[PDB]
Each structure stands twice: as C-alpha cells, then as structure tokens.
Symmetry: D2
DNA sequence: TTAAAATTAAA
DNA sequence: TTTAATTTTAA
C-alpha cells in the first residue's frame, strides 16, 4: 500500500488504542464504586440491575412490567 | 504429531462440529417458536423475560426483587 | 387474557424451555469433548479457534488473513 | 435503611451512572474512528482484529499461532 | 438485531 | 472448578 495510507492506518490504530485505554480506566472506576458499595453492605448484583433498569424510559419499562405480569398471570406463575 | 495424535485431533474436531450443528439446529428451532409467537400477537421480549425468570429459584427471586424495590424507592424515579 | 390465549402462551413457554434444556445438554457435551481433549495434551483455546476457522468459507478467511498481514506489516507490527 | 445508607445508595448510583455516560461516550468515539476509517477504504473488521491482537503478548501470540499451524496441517490445512 | 463467543470474576 | 457474568464481536 501507499506511504500515506500506511500513515493513516497507524494513526487509526493508535487512536482506537488510546480510547480503549480510557474505556478501561472508566471500567475500573465503576468496579471501584461497586467495591465501595459492597463494603457499605449493599447488594452489588441488585445495584447493577438498578442502574440497568434506570437506563430505559420509565413509562416504557413500567408498561413492559405490566405485560410481564399479564403473562406470568396467564401461565399461572 | 503422531499418526494417532492427529487421529485423535481429527476425532475431536469431528465430535465438536457435529455437536455444533445440533446446537445450531436447536437455536434455530428456538427462534422459530418466538417467530411464531410474535405472529400470534405475543411480545417476544417479554416472553424471553418470562423464560429467564422461570430459570431462577422462586425464593431468591422475590428476595432480590425485595432489595430492588428497597433501593428503587430509596432513590426514587 | 382468554383461557385460550393462556393455552397458547403455556405451550409456547413449554416449547422454549424444553429446547433450552436440549441446548444446555449439547453445550455440556461439547465441554466434555474439550475437557477430554485437554486431558490428552491438546490446547483447548487453539482447538476452539480451529473449529471457528473451519466455520468460515476458505476463500473469505484466506483473504481476510491476507488483508490482516498487510495491516500488521504496514504498522510495523510484523 | 438509615438516612446515611440512603445517602450512600444515592451517590453510589449517581457515580456509576455518570461513569456509564462517559464510557458510552468513548464507545461512540471509537465507532466514529472506525466509521471514518471505513470511508478511507480501510477494512473495519480487520482493523478491530489488529487492535485485539495487539492486546496480547507477542511471545504468547506467536506460540498459539504455531500450535494452530500444527493442528491445521495435521487435519489437512 | 442477533449472536455465539470468550475471556474473566467469583460463588 | 463449574455455573456466572463480564466483554465484545459477527453477522
């Protein structure tokens, strides 16, 4: 390939790798918060579901919760 | 490697690949059930949720849901 | 929902769950193949890679690999 | 739960969610880098493979690749 | 979307 | 040390 093209490839790779280093740091910071929470006596598993739950629109989730209750009711569970 | 060594290797590969084919068939059959369910007016997302839930122990389930409600009401939404 | 709709739902759930039990069994058997292989001196990680590779069309993988080497060479990685 | 426990939970959730926002922001930046690369005639799929490969130790990578060559050849490849 | 796929943490 | 769960990719 070209010399310039080789330059772009190298820049792209280095750029992605810098971003993935930042991502890794953030992931470590998240695990540190949960570590702190666990030390406080909180249930990490539930805490994570709390975060996940809050990511979706309230109205939509509650609607889906209602459908779930309808289904669980139908199959007798 | 030996003739017996490669003989074993060829056996392992053959065994894994035959099981992969069967696993693929089952996975396709599972999607067909959901496709049919969707066509019948059911919510596939909720359906998969129902399946997931029924895999969990009843006790632990309501136990983690109780903690969830505690956390959720504590932080509100 | 209707008593009939209830029937459809239950049958659907039963179908998925029986199929998932089947899937778990197959996945367990696959694991048993790898564990037996591992006990015989084979590299499990490499074995799975072989299986993965053999899933792709020879033509495709050969070209993707060619491109890969081109990139790895360009950045002085290889 | 105590008011202190309530305060802990509130900040724990808020800290995680802010980190999630940042992590998600980096993830879209990475997709943008790859999106731009695609426009520059680069193979995104191969690009990602280069990154993953560079995350492994050169010495170990060459070793696994050597074994791979042995296996493939043994079964005909 | 769907996936299958995997390395990894921890029960 | 085996079910989990975390991550990422294919497709």
């Amino acid at each position: 390939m070209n010399s310039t093209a080789q330059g772009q490839l190298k820049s792209i790779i280095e750029r992605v790798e810098r971003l993935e280093v930042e991502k890794a740091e953030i992931m470590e910071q998240i695990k540190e918060v949960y570590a702190e929470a666990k030390g406080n006596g909180f249930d990490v598993k539930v805490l994570k579901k709390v975060v996940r739950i809050r990511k979706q629109d309230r109205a939509k989730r509650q609607e889906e919760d209602a459908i779930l209750d309808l289904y669980m009711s139908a199959i007798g569970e």
